[PDB]
Amino acid sequence: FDDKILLITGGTGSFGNAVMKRFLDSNIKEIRIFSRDEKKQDDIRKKYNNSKLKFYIGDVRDSQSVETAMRDVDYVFHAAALKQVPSCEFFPVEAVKTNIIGTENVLQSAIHQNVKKVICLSTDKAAYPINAMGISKAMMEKVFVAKSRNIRSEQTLICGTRYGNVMPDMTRFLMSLEDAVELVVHAFKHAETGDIMVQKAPSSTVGDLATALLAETLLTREEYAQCEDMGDYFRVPADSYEYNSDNTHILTVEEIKEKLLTLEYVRNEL
Amino acid sequence: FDDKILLITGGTGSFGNAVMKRFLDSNIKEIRIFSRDEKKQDDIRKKYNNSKLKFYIGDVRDSQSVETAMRDVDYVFHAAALKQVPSCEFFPVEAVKTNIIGTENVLQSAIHQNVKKVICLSTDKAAYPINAMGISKAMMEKVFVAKSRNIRSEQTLICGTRYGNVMPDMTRFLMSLEDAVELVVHAFKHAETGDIMVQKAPSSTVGDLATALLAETLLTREEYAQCEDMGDYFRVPADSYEYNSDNTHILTVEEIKEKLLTLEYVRNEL
């Protein structure tokens, strides 16, 4: 990060911001926020009042606007997506345009600009997808994986990261926004080209959650078979029973309540 | 089919040909075979020696070549795909270009030409896909489904059909090529706009198959929940445990051998 330039596509999102407040008071050269929305960008600019933040208008659908932003960049965190389920169900083609083709553009541009590392953000919904958001995401995973095979890593390294949700008796994964940034920083440092990184996470029942108030699949069977264990993460390396919310360290109110406390968002009656 | 024109995209395939030998000696006006390959087209033309067969060079990636072929058509059987697994795994983007965007083009063109019915051919691999072929297919299903919502049916009716394979102890579905045409003819007649039709099929263990020589999922849990039963077919209608090869009428050698006999292909030592 000594004089290094980071580009975050979809930089104005929940995640882009979390990577920001993290990376900012650091000694990285420049953090390029790249997205469509001048309003969110304007809100970010004013508050942080920090010169390392560069704002780029553009969208991942358009190769020429990606290139401009991509010039002389070292690391890309590709977070730009259509990520809501109904919006993708009614407009699957838009899901395609952004999630899949948007990713081809980011990758081609990255390679052309001799970017060192690209990390594509993905979702547990891509593991056995049933909805268009998840499906398009699965397809984005295959896309970056195929690209990684063809590209020498010392030129450009290309990897991805699935996560479940951040921030009645059935179960769901528990990740904070702080936890999400971690997975990516982890991928940055340790991923080899083609890898999908997934964070090991506690997974509360949705019923026991609502009490602390005063099944999600992260790896397909086949992915768990092929994978590699890194401690708090599995690593699915590119080729050439299952990891889900019902079978990690499941928690009860006693623990559900504690993790909540740390969300600087939830602890708000001040 | 009185003076009706049928267009088959990917008309030169295993299926296109099966629909052909079926529909030909009929009284349909014209059967438009639309595909990329002049060689296969040439082989078809010579043999059948039948005036109702019209050959169109074009590909589904290209809207202008679709339109030409689409002019004054009544029914489309959309069979054009990249359907092999490794080829889609190494070239997912091509899978996207053909399977998903190819389908947007066919649909837009169909609608513009006031086509009456479009049937998109799909695959059991689209149900909980893990591979890019299947994934892109799943995405194609969402695409035609989304399009069907926005389009009045009396303008253009849009439906699809999944099938397993045609022609060690684990199980797999058994459909002939004759069985495959049936499913489509069925969809033609009875599908409402947005439907996915799936044929009920016997499903032998792969081990007991190889003996007659002298798990596949067709519906996701959620799809089986929502579906409607038509006898030899389920119907999944558009919104706004599972049906698989391990739990249909499973067969043993006695029955496996008999079905084989009818394949005009297998019974060949003449």
Place this chain on the structure above:
Amino acid sequence: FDDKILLITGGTGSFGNAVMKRFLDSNIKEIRIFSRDEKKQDDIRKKYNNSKLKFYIGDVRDSQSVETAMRDVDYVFHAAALKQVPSCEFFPVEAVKTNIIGTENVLQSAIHQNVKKVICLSTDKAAYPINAMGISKAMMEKVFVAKSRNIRSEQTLICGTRYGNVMPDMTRFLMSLEDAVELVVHAFKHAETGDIMVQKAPSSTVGDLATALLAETLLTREEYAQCEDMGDYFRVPADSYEYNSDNTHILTVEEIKEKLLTLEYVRNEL
């Protein structure tokens, strides 16, 4: 508005929302909100809880996504723009892509769908522009004006509306958001094809404004020459000293304070 369908491109904006809360409890058939951002769209959907609101994902840069949304629409309020000054100064091409070409797409699509009336929202900055936002806006005005000449009005009527800002001794125009909707409703009813409508508005000095706390050009000289007076609006009809903030009814604290009161936004210490 009896069974009439309205489409608002950039429907998620300050203005789109103002037109919404206005048109909603009415008897219009359907109000299509068309924009890029699923998050804003999601926030709107939840709150209003109103069936006439239809949400369309798409962007004006893309003709195919415009068409989908444009199907069977009667009236379009074209509000989609890159409207901040610095963002347009650093990324003029994006300004071009959205403000000018976005507008060609909306117009072509409108015409093709036999839309009855399209209203393009514009800005005082388009009158003698010096910045890229204003310049691109000026260009958008010429674009819709040129299109209006070529199109019979009984097919599709095409007009636009400039306004100054809504919501030290130099002067600036004073329009509320309520005032802005008015101008558009006015254009809807009374504009002929090609017209630019501009609202007559009081124009306080920025110095006397900040006191009530307890030059903008709307028409170029040449435009004032050619224009037509409608009472609270000027009408600039298509061809084949100046109207500015220093010379309307200028106001002092006594009046500045009163208009403020009505902004349901400013009167907030509750």
Place this chain on the structure above:
Amino acid sequence: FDDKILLITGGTGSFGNAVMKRFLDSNIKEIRIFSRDEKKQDDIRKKYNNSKLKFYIGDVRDSQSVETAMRDVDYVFHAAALKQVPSCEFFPVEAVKTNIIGTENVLQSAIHQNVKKVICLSTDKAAYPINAMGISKAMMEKVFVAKSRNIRSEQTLICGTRYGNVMPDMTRFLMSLEDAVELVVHAFKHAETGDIMVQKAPSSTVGDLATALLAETLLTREEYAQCEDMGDYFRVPADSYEYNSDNTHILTVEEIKEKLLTLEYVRNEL
């Protein structure tokens, strides 16, 4: 100009030719004339009978034809435009395609080919534009200015030049074609990346002109504020009362007549 290659887009114009007869008997390597019209190109080729002149068919709307011409070029004088007022008023989009997007293509191609300097020819009409020609030109100025910020100058230097007209009591600027080439040669040598250069020019009243037979704005107020004085030129450098024809050295018949004499065009009754 020792073995240097110059490309003139719109090379067949009034200006392209003036730069030609100037640069020709020099020792520059090659002067590439790039334009759409084979007829004008053919007329030029025949007459000059000079090997340094290379003729390229292409147009600035098309990136692939720009690249071909752009290969191994050192300096570009970008003169290709739709420059007549009514033609731009009726066909603003064409104005956009050529003047603005044509310029993005030329710039991108220039950069890719590691061109040393690009000079975009502009017009006084871009200063407070009211017409589409002027507006599109203003937009072209912002476009090249934005591009210059993002590009290191030692890679590719990007600048522009406004001029009034060349060759009843109100006033207008007086530049010859010889004067116009000068401004560009000046920009070539002295412009820094992002600069707009404007020539200081005498400005006769149109009434006193017609007698020698035997208001134009070059800088907006704001541009005059920010500018830098170079003697016979102002320099407007890129960010991060007015200069007009009514207030330069205005001339009377005595001087109007003399300047005329030098136009090798006007002195023609031979």
Place this chain on the structure above:
Amino acid sequence: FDDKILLITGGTGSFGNAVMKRFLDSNIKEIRIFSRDEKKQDDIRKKYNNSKLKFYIGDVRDSQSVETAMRDVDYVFHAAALKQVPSCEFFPVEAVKTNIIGTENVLQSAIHQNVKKVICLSTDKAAYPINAMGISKAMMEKVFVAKSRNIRSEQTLICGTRYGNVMPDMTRFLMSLEDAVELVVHAFKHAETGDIMVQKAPSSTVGDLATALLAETLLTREEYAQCEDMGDYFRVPADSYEYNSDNTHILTVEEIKEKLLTLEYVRNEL
């Protein structure tokens, strides 16, 4: 021609003008001149001073600019081409873009606008072509011919016209500009969809020509075989020894001199 609208693409050319001075003092509704060059268009506009002449900026490479011009047109004379030999030899792709794809655009647009008749101007060089101009022209002939098969004539009729040159012992065809317009008017009236019309023309030796100062192939062998004779024209109708300058009525000085006289161009020492 009662209230009929004619569009001439490449309307600013030698031919466009000849069709103009012909059709003008008539009672046709509107003659749309469509081309790239505002300068030629401006020169035409001023001189003829005639309201039936409408000037359209656009180029045939661009479908959207064709459509605008094509709206409500009855007859198209497609004369837009890259027609010089060396320019096509060095830039064959441009030849392709204009001559072949330009023609696909004109045809598609014509059909969409329910144009009654389109006439594509072609050249003797398309008969056994050896150069890129001729080759691209040959290809344009096949293109319009293929399109004519697929299109019902009562919708849109599509035909073409080859001619040799207008205005040492080897031979060449002799057509005036007046003769060229004739061939087209002839095609307009009598061509069936798919026809190539060729004018029968006297063909002087180039040696005997230069004396009156005080081999070209129009039909390939195969084309002469298939053709139909109409008096002063052959008609080559669409499928599903040779006609050349060495064997028409060849002329000697006595006749060469006389035909010359009529060229209002040659008889100029006044």
Place this chain on the structure above:
Amino acid sequence: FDDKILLITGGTGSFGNAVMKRFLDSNIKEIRIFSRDEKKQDDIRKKYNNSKLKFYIGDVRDSQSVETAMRDVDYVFHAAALKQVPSCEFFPVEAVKTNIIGTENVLQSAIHQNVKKVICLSTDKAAYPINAMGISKAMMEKVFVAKSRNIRSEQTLICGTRYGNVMPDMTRFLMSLEDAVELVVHAFKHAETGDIMVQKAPSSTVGDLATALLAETLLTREEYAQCEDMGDYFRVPADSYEYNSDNTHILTVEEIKEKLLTLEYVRNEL
């Protein structure tokens, strides 16, 4: 061929395969087969069972799929075409898309990837073409020839090869598939940039052929004039009576029968 990579576009064809069985048991690094059809590719893969064979899905119409395949390639044999006559006659535009534009893409991509040599396969039908296949081929020849002028050879060398047919009294050329590979290997080694190579070949009468069972033009007059003789080949170098089947070594049954024998295809009653 020491660690050299060969790409064959249209690699699945009659020719692609002939170049394969030739080059395979060699010591070349990698032979990239690039084409549209996964089925043919799959058939090739299985049989040869040889690691040097790499299979790429893509088509020449699409630049992005060409680039992927083109990365780090040393030699390209461009064999991808629409080569049947009727298919090109009915769909000339497809002929254009593949044969001409497909070739521009392959060339641009080749150059960008710093490919050493590209050989475009052509046909005797391009010499005085009368059909769209031949015409489009002629145009492809001009296209690669034009490109070769603009490109330094030490960067990328670009050449082509015409051949007649491989494998009543009128005559036709006789080349085997083995003969066809030869011509290309010859071009590989000896062609200079811009050359068209043509093989000297015996040319039997079609009547005397059918007896051994127990006019084609390769160079236009003008091409024979300009050409250079290399023994068993003519070489047509780029600029800045005829060679045909009726006048090579014509053969009678005695020789016709013998050449046949060697076709490992014809000698099949085993």
